[PDB]
């Protein structure tokens, strides 16, 4: 009795929806970041009694991250020089140094320079992963991506790199968050919080494994889609980093070619020829794979688990790919994953041979090509691997077979934004109460 309509504003209630997210980050360096002006500082509030649903496979911010990264790379490459005139027929025998089978470029070509009436027989070095033989006489060669796309040299000073980025919601939207220690990226979290901005997310580019990542709270977490037993990619998140080290011992000599633009070829290789390689702590890798197998055979309880190397595809998926400095690696991982398990600290080091190339097809798809300028001197690198991008083979009876994959770059960042979710605040609500309004 005597209950009347009343309305409230600023109510704590929300609904899920997709929206644009902000770009905010710390003070800009190098004159992955092109964003101005802001200085974020997040604060987290643990919400009592808040039970909320989550889903890593459906959240829109992964797609926004993907588009933002692609657009940022495009804007990075927008002012840089284009290597179109280099497409002319190369003449190549190239047996100068001790090892030419490794590189095989030592190639000459007629470039037009600075007058449009004079041509000069320059010559430079190239890895024959970047070079494809022309039909007929086997001494004629050509750049690999010229007949399919244009090639842009990366600007040497603009060194886009995994700089941390914070994604902030706009006013009227709140980024929810979950810190349940045993969350597989989907299902309800009864331990929820909110923040203005995400942590310093790094846009790392790698295949067969994701590095410089975060580490789980409990033991190793195995996140996967659960619509069907048939799955595209199974993400495994480590709780204990394993250190990977890599190096390129040779001393490379940069050279400039005038095609005020300039083209930065490899002038000469100094020092005796040694193929690039990387190191892994053998005992740590054994223990990590054993724990991964023990965790993984809970989902698949009555079958053996065997790890084997990938099959087919491009170099981006057949070998572990990544970047250190201004060079790109493609490291044979066959010796690592060749393991099997039954169904029932740094004493030794594994070494893996590895190859580098310059003409990088754009990682998502082919049609636009990047050319990496050579990094002079010798290179060393250290990084922390934190997760595995596995994918299983179906159609095999009484034996599972998980093998590395992950060519689709989106899985790298979907493995990180499982925490977050964006909701739209719905501040207005009604209720019954005692009332009067004088008339």
């Amino acid at each position, epitope marked *: 009795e005597n209950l009347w309509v009343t309305v409230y504003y600023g109510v704590p209630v929300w609904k899920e929806a997709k929206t644009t997210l902000f770009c905010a980050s710390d003070a800009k360096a190098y004159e992955t970041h092109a964003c101005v002006p802001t200085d974020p500082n997040p604060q987290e509030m643990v919400l009592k009694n808040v039970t909320e649903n989550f889903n890593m496979w459906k959240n829109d911010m992964v797609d926004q991250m993907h588009e933002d990264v692609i657009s940022l790379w495009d804007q990075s490459l927008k002012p840089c020089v284009k290597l179109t005139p280099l497409c002319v027929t190369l003449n190549c025998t190239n047996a100068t140094a001790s090892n030419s089978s490794i590189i095989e470029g030592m190639c000459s070509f007629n470039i037009t320079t600075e007058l449009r009436d004079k041509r000069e027989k320059k010559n430079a070095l190239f890895y024959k992963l970047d070079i494809v033989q022309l039909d007929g006489n086997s001494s004629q060669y050509r750049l690999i991506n010229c007949n399919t796309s244009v090639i842009t040299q990366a600007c040497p000073k603009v060194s886009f790199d995994p700089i941390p980025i914070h994604y902030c919601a706009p006013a009227g939207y709140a980024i929810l968050k979950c810190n349940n220690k045993t969350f597989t990226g989907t299902g309800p979290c009864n331990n929820v919080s909110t923040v203005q901005c995400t942590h310093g997310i790094k846009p790392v580019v790698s295949t067969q494994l994701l590095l410089n990542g975060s580490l789980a709270e409990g033991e190793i977490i195995i996140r996967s889609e659960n619509i069907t*037993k048939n799955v595209k990619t199974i993400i495994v998140h480590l709780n204990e980093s394993v250190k990977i080290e890599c190096t390129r011992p040779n001393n490379k000599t940069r050279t400039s070619i005038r095609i005020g633009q300039w083209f930065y070829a490899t002038g000469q290789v100094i020092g005796d020829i040694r193929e690039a390689y990387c190191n892994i702590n053998e005992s740590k890798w054994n223990e990590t794979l054993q724990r991964v197998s023990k965790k993984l055979k809970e989902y698949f309880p009555h079958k053996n688990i065997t790890f084997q190397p990938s099959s*087919g*595809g491009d170099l981006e998926i057949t070998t572990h790919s990544f970047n250190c400095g201004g060079e790109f690696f493609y490291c044979n991982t066959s010796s690592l994953f060749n393991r099997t398990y039954m169904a029932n600290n740094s004493t030794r080091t594994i070494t893996i041979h590895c190859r580098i190339k310059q003409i990088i097809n754009m990682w998502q798809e*082919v049609g636009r090509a990047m050319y990496a300028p050579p990094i002079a001197g010798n290179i060393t690198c250290i990084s922390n691997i934190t997760g595995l991008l596995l994918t299983r083979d179906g159609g095999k009876n009484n034996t599972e077979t998980f093998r590395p*994959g992950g060519g689709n770059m989106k899985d790298n960042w979907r493995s990180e934004l499982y925490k977050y979710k964006v909701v739209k605040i719905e501040p207005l609500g009604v209720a019954p109460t005692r009332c009067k309004r004088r008339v």
Partner: antibody, heavy 122, light 107 residues
Framework: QVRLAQYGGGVKRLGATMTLSCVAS????????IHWVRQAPGQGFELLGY????????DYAGALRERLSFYRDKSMETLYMDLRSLRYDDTAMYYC???????????????WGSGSPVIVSS | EIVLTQSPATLSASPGERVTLTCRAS??????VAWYQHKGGQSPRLLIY???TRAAGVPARFSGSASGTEFTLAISNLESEDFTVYFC????????FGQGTRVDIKR
């Protein structure tokens, strides 16, 4: 709109290698996996394997892992398959078929190709 | 593993009748099942891409329902064109097909 044309077929001699093909058309090439199914006469359909078009990752059936081999060509939007050492019971007509792949799982076929009959006999 | 034992081999129905088909899975396949219409050698067509959800462009007379491990496709107004071969599919595992059921003219 989408059409999956096929080429190759006819008679292939016993013990010889063969190479079918496919050509995508009215859709984004990278977004849909391609599968190769076959039907021997007097048998139900069965799957051989599937090839991701973007990164080229294949995956074959258990009984035919040695013989099969899948590869593509992104620029022409073309796919292939090679079945080495044809046996007599390879007499079958082979479809290429698309599937609707979600963000984290694969699902049913939607659009089937025109198919390529293959007769193994010398 | 999964053996979709589609049955019966041949269904007989007069034109205009209602008719039903069955696709017995050997074990659990969740809701991951689809049905197709085979033709005179031409490309098969998608009818239902779950146990019940009809596909785009399909005539409304085609309908399906789940029964756990057993699945069903039902045609309400059996026209002359529908007298053809239908096979069932499952995509919960490695992917298997049924033997195909023919729908012929009753007499």
């Amino acid at each position: 709109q989408v059409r999956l044309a096929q080429y190759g077929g006819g008679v292939k001699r016993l013990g010889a290698t063969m190479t079918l093909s496919c050509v995508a058309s009215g859709y984004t090439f990278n977004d849909y996996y391609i599968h190769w199914v076959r039907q021997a006469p007097g048998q139900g359909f069965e799957l051989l394997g599937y090839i991701d078009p973007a990164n080229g990752r294949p995956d074959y059936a258990g009984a035919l892992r040695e013989r099969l081999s899948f590869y593509r060509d992104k620029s022409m939007e073309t796919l292939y398959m090679d079945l080495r050492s044809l046996r007599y019971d390879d007499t079958a007509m082979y479809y290429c078929v698309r599937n609707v792949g979600t963000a984290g799982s694969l699902l049913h076929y939607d659009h089937w190709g025109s198919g390529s009959p293959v007769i193994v006999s010398s | 593993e999964i053996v979709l034992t589609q049955s019966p081999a041949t269904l007989s129905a007069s034109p205009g009748e209602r008719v039903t088909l069955t696709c017995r899975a050997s074990r659990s396949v969740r809701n991951n099942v689809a049905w197709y219409q085979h033709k005179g050698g031409q490309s098969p067509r998608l009818l239902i891409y779950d146990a019940s959800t009809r596909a785009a462009g399909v005539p409304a007379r085609f309908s399906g329902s789940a029964s756990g491990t057993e699945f069903t496709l039902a045609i309400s107004n059996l026209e002359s064109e529908d007298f053809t071969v239908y096979f069932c599919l499952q995509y919960n595992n490695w992917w298997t097909f049924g033997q195909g059921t023919r729908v012929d003219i009753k007499r």
